Amino acid sequence: MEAIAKYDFKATADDELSFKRGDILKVQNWYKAELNGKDGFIPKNYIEMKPHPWFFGKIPRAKAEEMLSKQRHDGAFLIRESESAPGDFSLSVKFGNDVQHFKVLRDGAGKYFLWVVKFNSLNELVDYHRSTSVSRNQQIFLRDIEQVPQQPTYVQALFDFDPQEDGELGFRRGDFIHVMDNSDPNWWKGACHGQTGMFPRNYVTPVNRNV
Amino acid sequence: MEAIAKYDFKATADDELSFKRGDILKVQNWYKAELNGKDGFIPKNYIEMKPHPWFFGKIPRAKAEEMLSKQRHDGAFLIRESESAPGDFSLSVKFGNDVQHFKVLRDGAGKYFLWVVKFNSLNELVDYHRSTSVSRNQQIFLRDIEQVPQQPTYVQALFDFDPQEDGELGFRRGDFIHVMDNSDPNWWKGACHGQTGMFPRNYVTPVNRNV
């Protein structure tokens, strides 16, 4: 399960892992995990769910311009949907000290492209323009924004789940269980009553954000 | 499907429905919907998903204090989990001009209680304390907070879904589809490519917020 560090941490002893707030770490109060090759232990309460690296919903151009402009690397970006003209997507990149826009076009035959080359998904396009520059300026790569830990994502339980086996997380119906990993289609890694663990997606209806 | 008004609207005709931003509406570019008893039409891109009315995750006491204090009614409240001491919940209420808390404790066999009576869910507790006061000052009732529309919640699609019949929403593998209603365990009402509609949950993996 990966996760983003939410607080910095200094190796409290020799079996640990030193990370800065915002680092993404590939992860009984302490999980073992790994960061840049070197690995070790990590307190449970210092990690949170890894947010979307680049899809920034309907984040308006201003804000787009803002957070992106304030970044320690050229080619930092997000992809955003239009509030206004809904069905439309637009790339935004950190060019020098400025945000340089690009409309991403979808040719009816389900495919997104910016100019000449067509792809089957915005991701494919993205990684495509990780190494193959997004302009006649053969440097401007798309590298992920310096990401920061966000408020916890919380699901709610429909039916009690007495934790059948070891690793399973127990919760009653009504329980607000804090979700740490949810990338997997049937088993989500939550945290619920002091203990943390796996739990079947299908027993839990979401709790929509409000902060 | 319910929804929170995102922008104020003035009844642009005789079949309409003016609502102020934050209003919760019981909801081809115009949905037919109803408000205070009288109903009519509403533009589709003036509504967003109804957030959780009272569960405010790991919202710190300060903040709790903060937004709760700024409320147009006594008894406004939230329920929040505690950043530090994980497994515990605490109610916060708008008493006159100030926030008065109460630890919600759970008694072993999974039940939440404030003092004398036990319930099997925070919800059960909350509705209990809507009619039946939460002090000895026999008015303090749990009135839900003046709710305001949040950032859109977006799922991503695992597998194409040529829409089987219409009301169904069509999208390819990779598409970031915007969720309006996801209360129902198997069929979520999204909005994906100009068109909006139903689509089975099992086809989309979430997209974690970062704004």
Of A12, A33, A48, the domain-final residue: A48
- Residue A190: exposed, middle, or buried by beta-carbon count in 10 A (0-12, 13-18, 19+)? buried
Q: Are residues B60 and B136 in the same domain?
A: yes
Q: Are residues B32 and B57 in the same domain?
A: no
Contact A210 B52 (CB under 8 A): yes
**Alpha-carbon gap, residue A6 to A178, rounded angstroms:** 15
User: What are the distances in angstroms from CA B98 to CA B40, B64, B66, B71?
Assistant: 39, 11, 9, 10
CB atoms within 10 A of CB A93: 23
Q: Are residues B64 and B84 in the same domain?
A: yes
Query: What's the token pair of residue B159?
Result: 């597998």
**Alpha-carbon gap, residue A16 to A39, rounded angstroms:** 7
Query: What's the token pair of residue A145?
Result: 């924004």
**Gaps in chain A with C–N over 2.5 Å, residue before each:** 27
Give the position of tokens 């009619």: B131
CATH of the domain at A43: 2.30.30.40
Pick from B152, B173, B210: which is nearest to A147 by CB? B210
- Residue B161: exposed, middle, or buried by beta-carbon count in 10 A (0-12, 13-18, 19+)? buried
Q: Are B23 and B200 in contact (CB under 8 A)?
A: no
Pick from A57, A123, A152: which is nearest to B151 by CB? A57
DSSP 8-class letter at B116: S
Contact A86 B45 (CB under 8 A): yes
Q: Are residues A41 and A57 in the same domain?
A: no
Q: Are residues A43 and A133 in the same domain?
A: no
CB atoms within 10 A of CB B176: 23
Number of domains chain A is built from? 3
| Most distant CA atoms of chain B, gap in Å | 59
* Chain A residue at shortest CA distance from B160: A110
- Domain extent for B28: 1-48
Return the half-sphere exposure (C-beta side, CA atoms, 13 A cut-off) of residue A31. Answer: 18
* Chain A residue at shortest CA distance from B162: A110
Q: Are residues B89 and B141 in the same domain?
A: yes
**Alpha-carbon gap, residue A207 to A157, rounded angstroms:** 10
**Alpha-carbon gap, residue A90 to B166, rounded angstroms:** 29
Q: Are A107 and A113 in contact (CB under 8 A)?
A: yes
Of the candidates A94, A91, A105, A79, the one whose C-alpha atom is nearest the C-alpha of residue A137 is A94
Q: Are B22 and B146 in contact (CB under 8 A)?
A: yes
Length of chain A: 211
